[PDB]
């Protein structure tokens, strides 16, 4: 029951991973109003680079 609920949570986690992959696919199709979207993508890339530098530091 809670094992079935945990299998349901694993199915919902697969659906949430598919939803996050669909969001990333929409972001990649945006990478594939225009200036503002490009600036937001550049800011996200800079934040990812800063996170990678912090992770390499630790």
């Amino acid at each position: 029951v809670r094992a079935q609920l945990k299998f349901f949570e694993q199915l919902d986690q697969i659906e949430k991973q598919r939803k996050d992959e669909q969001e990333r696919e929409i972001l990649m199709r945006a990478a594939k109003l225009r200036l503002k979207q490009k600036a937001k993508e550049m800011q996200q890339q800079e934040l990812a680079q800063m996170r990678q530098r912090d992770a390499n530091l630790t």
Binding site: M50, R53, D54, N56, L57, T58
Partner: protein
């Protein structure tokens, strides 16, 4: 930042968590959550509470800058906090942006 994990408070907390892991009373994931909450709490406490000023003077032995992190090693240093001198033979400084 996990930066203050290597302090007296932070390493004492890590040693207590490692003891509780060794006796199987907690999981390592739980200790990781405690370390994350400690990081948030020590960042908030250093940001809001303390408002005092220190100066220091000494001789630089070595420096390093990598992954946007400075790492210094100073010798024969005098840290000045208002009500008095603090002398130290060698000190290591780790600084994140």
């Amino acid at each position: 930042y996990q930066l203050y994990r290597n302090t007296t408070l932070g390493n004492s907390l890590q040693e207590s968590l490692d003891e509780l892991i060794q006796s199987q009373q907690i999981t390592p994931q739980l200790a990781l959550q405690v370390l994350l909450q400690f990081d948030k709490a020590i960042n908030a406490a250093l940001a809001q509470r303390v408002r005092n000023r220190v100066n220091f003077r000494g001789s630089l032995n070595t420096y390093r800058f990598c992954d946007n992190v400075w790492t210094f090693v100073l010798n024969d240093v005098e840290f000045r906090e208002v009500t008095e001198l603090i002398k130290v033979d060698k000190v290591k400084i780790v600084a994140c942006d």
